[PDB]
């Protein structure tokens, strides 16, 4: 069918949305997931260290 | 003009039909070994997946040259010019 300059316009739109997504959408969301994952890891490791500390008291 | 144009619809149907036939059987052979490898080795699935898509690039290459020249004969015509 008709091949037109529409593919140039589509290419411009693709890069604009990907560059905005990379700078203002993906980093803030993955940072929240990483902070939460660290809190869940620390929630087990700090609790296990505090429970094991009793061996020194004994 | 009527014979060259009516025989170009048959040419297009053979370029896209034989390519559609060979790639649907080829991916049924390739993919059938990927599903078994994924069952035999559950931990290898991410490696087998990337290795299958390398083969998929070899499997459809000549088919896509035929689907591309077929679309060129459907919206342009290098033969009608030869009259």
């Amino acid at each position: 069918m008709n091949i037109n300059a529409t593919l140039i316009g589509q290419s411009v739109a693709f890069f604009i949305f990907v560059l905005f997504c990379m700078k203002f959408v993906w980093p803030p969301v993955i940072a929240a997931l990483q902070e939460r994952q660290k809190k869940i890891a620390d929630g087990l490791d700090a609790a296990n260290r505090a429970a094991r500390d009793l061996e020194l008291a004994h | 003009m009527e014979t060259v144009v009516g025989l170009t619809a048959i040419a297009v149907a053979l370029l896209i039909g034989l390519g559609a036939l060979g790639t649907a059987i080829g991916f049924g052979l390739l993919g059938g070994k990927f599903l078994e490898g994924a069952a035999r080795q559950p931990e290898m699935v991410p490696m087998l997946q990337v290795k299958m898509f390398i083969v998929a690039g070899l499997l459809d290459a000549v088919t896509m040259i035929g689907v591309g020249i077929a679309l060129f004969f459907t919206f342009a015509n290098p033969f009608v010019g030869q009259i």
Binding site: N2, Q10, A13, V18, F20, V25, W26, I30 | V67
Partner: protein
């Protein structure tokens, strides 16, 4: 009016070109549109694709701009599910450090899904409302953006620019030309190597050029057959016969339910092929 006229009207895009009539100009007939040069834009397709791109980008930014870190809200919970799914798909396919692949995969998946989502509504609802709002009962208008070869080629050619760019950036220009001529076959002596360089290029160049063409046509094929089958099913009701209309509604529902798989698979496969093709521009396989 005849059914051939309705189908032929539906298969035409809203086109714009600088005609001599004035600075602004639109195509009023199919012949007049096909007569224009390659320098004419399909305004309906650019309109819908940009609008849905901004909708995707806006709803994700509404969550990202206020991420709670702790307990997530109703929208943030959905946004995190998409980010977690894409990052899992990227980490399982690519072992590098490039920060562009994940934002690209998320954008490509959600955008292509929304461009296909507008296909589930009745095919002549949007065209009639667009015609009535514009004040022209004979206006051309197509809502689904992926049923136009140009939209799918715009997506694949842009992905191909990134594939060539990263390949040259990490392998170097001399190294990239080297992959296309020094692999897969090589020899300890120059006299055999010079006979293998045309064979190496004949294998690599063909398998490289098929990547942008396959991505576009694989996305266009299933979607164009899908819209066209809905237009043909809609003509079934136009006959006015009761039994034929009863068959038409049953086929439309069955086809739409089957299409919920197709809309999801084409968006997912375009995302996976994008990640895979970019991941093999940072590694070596000969």
């Amino acid at each position: 009016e005849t059914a051939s006229g309705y189908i032929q009207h539906h298969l035409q895009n809203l086109t714009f070109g600088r005609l001599p009539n004035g600075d602004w100009g639109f195509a009023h007939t199919a012949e007049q549109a096909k007569e224009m040069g390659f320098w004419a834009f399909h305004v309906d397709t650019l309109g819908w694709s940009v609008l849905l791109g901004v909708v995707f980008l806006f709803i994700f930014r509404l969550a990202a701009k206020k991420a709670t870190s702790g307990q997530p809200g109703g929208l943030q919970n959905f946004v995190e599910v998409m980010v977690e799914f894409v990052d899992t798909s990227v980490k399982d396919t690519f072992h590098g450090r490039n920060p562009l692949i994940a934002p690209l995969a998320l954008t490509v998946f959600v955008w292509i899904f929304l461009l296909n989502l507008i296909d589930l509504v009745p095919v002549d609802y949007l065209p009639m409302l667009a015609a009535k709002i514009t004040g022209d009962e004979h206006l051309f208008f197509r809502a689904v953006a992926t049923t136009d070869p140009n939209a799918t080629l715009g997506l694949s050619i842009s992905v191909f620019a990134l594939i060539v760019f990263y390949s040259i950036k990490v392998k170097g220009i001399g190294g990239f030309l080297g992959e296309l001529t020094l692999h897969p076959f090589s020899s300890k002596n120059i006299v055999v190597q010079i006979l293998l360089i045309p064979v190496n290029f004949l294998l690599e160049f063909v398998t490289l050029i098929a990547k942008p063409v396959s991505l576009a046509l694989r996305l266009f094929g299933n979607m164009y057959a899908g819209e066209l089958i809905f237009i043909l099913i809609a003509v079934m009701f136009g006959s006015g016969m009761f039994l034929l209309s009863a068959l038409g509604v049953a086929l439309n529902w069955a086809w739409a339910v089957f299409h919920i798989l197709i809309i999801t698979l084409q968006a997912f496969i375009f995302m996976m092929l994008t990640i895979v093709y970019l991941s093999m521009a940072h590694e070596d396989n000969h």
